[PDB]
């Protein structure tokens, strides 16, 4: 049978023993035995271990920035609170099902500031596509006249992306927990987006 | 002259080198360096490099909690928005202030499970009086007919507790930035919370 290519292998593997143990305390030689790979074979395919993990973040977002496009494509004409609140719930039922992936994301945050900021500047153009999308969508609102375009992007996109946070790290490694509260957690979004659509517009 | 206590140089040197390096990557050896100490000396007075960390945790929330006791005792009747406002304004000030201090709890999020939930236990009181204040505070607001007590707390400690997070991560290491740009930063909390005051309440 058709096994993972080896590069597949340890990359599964990395995001395993990163998301379980972080950046600073994962082993490259765990990683090797985790993913039954001889221990030379990291170096020859990954270099080092930041190359091992920043390749490792990157395979992750390519595959939910896939997940992004598509939805897009298929939601770009909604209401951009309706956009957000169904991407959200989106999110929220990729990251029960992935597991791994999701514990291994919130690590980001424990790597040294060379690693994130080359992992931030190398993000920045994939998450530009929604910053942009709101961006342009927030001309659609008839906002009160004392919020301007800027405050409201700002607060949207802080609602978006630290909502994801704070899941991610509540949630960590609990996906039956997620799965218990995500009903609850979408009436949630949906009343909290609702207030900030009001308090944003005339 | 008088110099810091021992236990009070090891402290500082710690919340300085934990907060340059994270707790993972942090040694004690080069705390003791730092403090000026035999390296046998964080042994004697705090055992093990988690017990120092929790030490200097605690040390760094309790300067904290009474400053926010002083502040409480001086606020108490005030609405709760503006409240909080001034509330943040008082700690952006402290944090520019207190650079090393503001650096070092950001840290908490990169220990390990049984440290972070051990220093989680231990300020839950601490934190609870906050909290419960905004709590009481909430049945003096005249809230919109489908905006729960519940969602009203939950999205006010996330607006609250999230934007301190993001500040303090954002600015880590550059106080003159922070101190640049706080006068922005203060008008655009008052706009954020004036668009939650409004989309919260009838």
Same mark, same amino acid.
Request: glycine share 4%; net charge neutral; proline share 1%.
């Given at each position: ?8 292998? +340890? ?19 765990? +990683?090797? $035995? ?7 074979? +990291? ?7 930041? !190359? ?27 209401? &951009?609170?309706?956009?957000? !609140?169904?991407? &959200? ?10 597991? @791994? !992936?999701?514990?291994?994301? &919130? ?11 080359? +992992? ?29 375009? $800027? &405050? ?11 909502? @994801? ?10 996906? @039956? ?9 979408? @009436? ?15």
């Amino acid at each position: 049978g058709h096994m993972l290519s080896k590069r597949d292998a +340890i990359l599964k593997a990395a995001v395993e023993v990163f998301g379980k143990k972080g950046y600073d305390r994962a082993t490259t030689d765990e +990683i090797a $035995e985790k993913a039954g790979v001889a221990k030379g074979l +990291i170096f020859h395919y990954f270099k080092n271990k930041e !190359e091992l993990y920043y390749q490792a973040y990157m395979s992750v977002t390519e595959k939910l920035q896939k997940e992004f496009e598509n939805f897009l494509m298929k939601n770009r004409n909604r209401d &951009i609170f309706d956009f957000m !609140e169904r991407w &959200i719930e989106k999110k929220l039922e990729y990251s029960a099902s992935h597991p @791994e !992936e999701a514990d291994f994301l &919130i690590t980001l945050v424990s790597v040294d500031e060379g690693l994130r900021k080359r +992992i931030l500047l190398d993000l920045e153009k994939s998450q530009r596509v929604f910053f942009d999308f709101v961006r342009e969508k927030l001309k659609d609102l008839d906002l009160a006249e004392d919020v301007t375009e $800027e &405050i409201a992007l700002k607060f949207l996109m802080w609602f978006f992306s630290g909502f @994801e946070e704070v899941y991610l790290r509540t949630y960590q490694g609990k996906p @039956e927990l997620l799965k218990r509260d995500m009903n609850t957690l979408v @009436e949630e979004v949906k009343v909290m987006l609702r207030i900030l659509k009001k308090g944003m517009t005339k």
